[PDB]
Amino acid sequence: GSATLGRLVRAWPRRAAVVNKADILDEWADYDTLVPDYPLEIVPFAEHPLFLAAEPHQRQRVLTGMWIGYNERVIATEQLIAEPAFDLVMHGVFPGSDDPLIRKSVQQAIVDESFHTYMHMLAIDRTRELRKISERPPQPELVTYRRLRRVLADMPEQWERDIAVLVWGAVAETCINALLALLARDATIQPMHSLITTLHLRDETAHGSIVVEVVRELYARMNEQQRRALVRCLPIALEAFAEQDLSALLLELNAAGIRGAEEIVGDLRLVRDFSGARKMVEQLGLDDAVDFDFPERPDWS
Amino acid sequence: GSATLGRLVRAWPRRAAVVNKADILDEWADYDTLVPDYPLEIVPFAEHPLFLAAEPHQRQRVLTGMWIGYNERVIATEQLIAEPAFDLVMHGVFPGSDDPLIRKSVQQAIVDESFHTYMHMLAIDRTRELRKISERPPQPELVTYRRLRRVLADMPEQWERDIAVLVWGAVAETCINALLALLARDATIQPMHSLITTLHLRDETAHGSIVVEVVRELYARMNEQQRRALVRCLPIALEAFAEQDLSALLLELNAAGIRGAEEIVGDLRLVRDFSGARKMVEQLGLDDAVDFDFPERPDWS
């Protein structure tokens, strides 16, 4: 099979977050409240005069709410979008998906996503306890998921449903959230927050390459109509993931009690790294077939 | 909160198979064909004259097929029975399930089961390759899963379906396969086969305790009609897992080409350790209310 796939599979034990930092709970050991939860630097409205007009404790509440929000959306994306695409591959619904190397690589990724959910849930649970947050609004359905659920609405054919689920998961795993890399590299925020994002980024870097490899091999074995449908839904999913939703922002701002939240969000760079998906598209021989305009590779990538 | 739960959560990092034997795939490194896959000592028809009349290679195909059969049923059990009950706990439908300690303990078990699946899949893949087994049906739908789908098909009400899932999952995680314990301690079979089962047994012992605490905690928060539904389906589930099924062994004997297989099967202990579910029943205070005769806990327990 793919030598690259072979490598990623053999490398998993020494790379994986679950193997090498199972004791993440312990990282809250000697917590210090005075370190912030989220970097002000990457807050798009950090210097909006209405944000500066607020109380220092309101600004901190916003920083904290954005961190928690970030975590909630990571868990939702994984559970609703990424894992179901991995689960379909393991279920053998695609020809060539019975290959023992494809199955090994994907099942390893499933173990990782299980651990990612665990780390992010612990992040939320520990932040809430330690910052004394009794009840915040969890509320909004992921926007990416809403868009996916609309695609599937008028789609009776199971084989076509499966292509869509596979594509949405592939995009999700090959387009890296800006906040993942930015939080990973930040030395000003809580050490466990930068740790968790660092561990997650290390696994996700691997998942991106696995997906490029797996999708190429599956596209190769798909019938003509599966192939066309894959190329069809690619730009849709890609546009869904390129989209920025300010709606999350408004809610946090309003929650921390900041006056003129609507003007801040109105008056208002966190672009995903699409490089993995560019690589995926190219490996399909579709570097002329997909109606999507790839954002130029981000500086942190 | 439950002290036991607190315990198992803190111990998970040093206990979990995924942390301590993630490089299980390397374990095929010095493979020796001469060592059997399965212990003749625990094969029920090992001393049957018709099985003794077979050619040596045919006895070996049977031993190997039973090992593969075992692994296939483990994966099916984890994916169709156990995981869906853990997944229901995490998605919040039961009152009290929002508790952070229950969430930590169950998400840890989810990570474990992902890895159990990985280990068993590898076991099959490596066996098929090395024993040069190219064609084989996975064939029969799980008997316990068939029984489950039967019970579910006549439930129009989602809340009732939820109880059955939970309970079926609960019984699966508290009633230990004899094969799991018998293979773990066997010094005569391939060392990876006894390794895989030993690692899975370590994790499964903790899962049974977790499930006892979680179930008790969730039963307490349930409404009256949920209480009743849990109590009613417990003996139904216990019976499925107590049920001996001979159908798979028949296929193995036929696949191997053993003459008089039917008569060997018709002529035909592998009882689970129900001690875990015994403790669960007593933790619910339900000793008088469930109609099930627990077997005397096995020597290996």
Short mmCIF file of C-alpha atoms in Angstrom, two decimals, chain A residues 9 12-13 18-19 22-23 25 79 90-91 100 103-104 107-108 110-111 114-115 117-118 121-122 125-126, chain B residues 9-10 12-13 18-19 22-23 25 79 90-91 100 103-104 107-108 110-111 114-115 117-118 121-122 125:
data_model
loop_
_atom_site.label_atom_id
_atom_site.label_comp_id
_atom_site.label_asym_id
_atom_site.label_seq_id
_atom_site.Cartn_x
_atom_site.Cartn_y
_atom_site.Cartn_z
CA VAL A 9 0.63 3.66 11.02
CA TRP A 12 1.30 6.19 15.82
CA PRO A 13 2.45 4.77 19.21
CA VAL A 18 -3.44 9.26 24.09
CA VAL A 19 -0.24 7.21 24.51
CA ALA A 22 -2.93 10.10 29.17
CA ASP A 23 -2.52 11.99 32.47
CA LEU A 25 -6.16 15.63 34.18
CA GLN A 79 -18.56 13.94 17.11
CA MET A 90 -14.40 1.18 9.02
CA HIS A 91 -17.87 -0.10 8.14
CA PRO A 100 -5.90 -3.76 6.41
CA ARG A 103 -8.35 0.14 8.47
CA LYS A 104 -5.31 0.35 10.75
CA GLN A 107 -8.97 3.00 13.60
CA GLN A 108 -5.89 4.65 15.17
CA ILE A 110 -10.72 6.94 15.94
CA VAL A 111 -8.82 6.20 19.17
CA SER A 114 -11.98 9.65 21.36
CA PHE A 115 -9.06 11.09 23.40
CA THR A 117 -13.03 14.67 23.02
CA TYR A 118 -11.81 13.62 26.51
CA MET A 121 -14.28 18.03 27.82
CA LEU A 122 -11.80 18.08 30.73
CA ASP A 125 -15.07 21.07 33.05
CA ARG A 126 -11.87 22.37 34.73
CA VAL B 9 -10.63 7.95 36.76
CA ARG B 10 -7.29 8.83 38.43
CA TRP B 12 -6.88 5.16 34.12
CA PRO B 13 -3.57 6.64 32.78
CA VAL B 18 -3.89 2.07 25.03
CA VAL B 19 -1.29 3.82 27.18
CA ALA B 22 -0.09 0.92 21.90
CA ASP B 23 2.68 -0.83 19.90
CA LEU B 25 1.30 -4.36 16.15
CA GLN B 79 -19.54 -1.66 18.29
CA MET B 90 -22.32 11.02 27.00
CA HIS B 91 -25.10 12.59 24.94
CA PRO B 100 -18.38 15.60 35.21
CA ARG B 103 -18.49 11.92 31.96
CA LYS B 104 -14.77 11.43 32.65
CA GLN B 107 -15.29 8.86 28.00
CA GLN B 108 -12.20 7.02 29.23
CA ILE B 110 -14.95 4.94 25.10
CA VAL B 111 -11.29 5.53 24.38
CA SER B 114 -11.81 2.15 20.43
CA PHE B 115 -8.44 0.53 21.22
CA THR B 117 -11.39 -2.84 18.58
CA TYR B 118 -8.01 -1.83 17.15
CA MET B 121 -8.92 -6.14 14.30
CA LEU B 122 -5.11 -6.47 14.17
CA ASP B 125 -5.67 -9.29 10.18
#
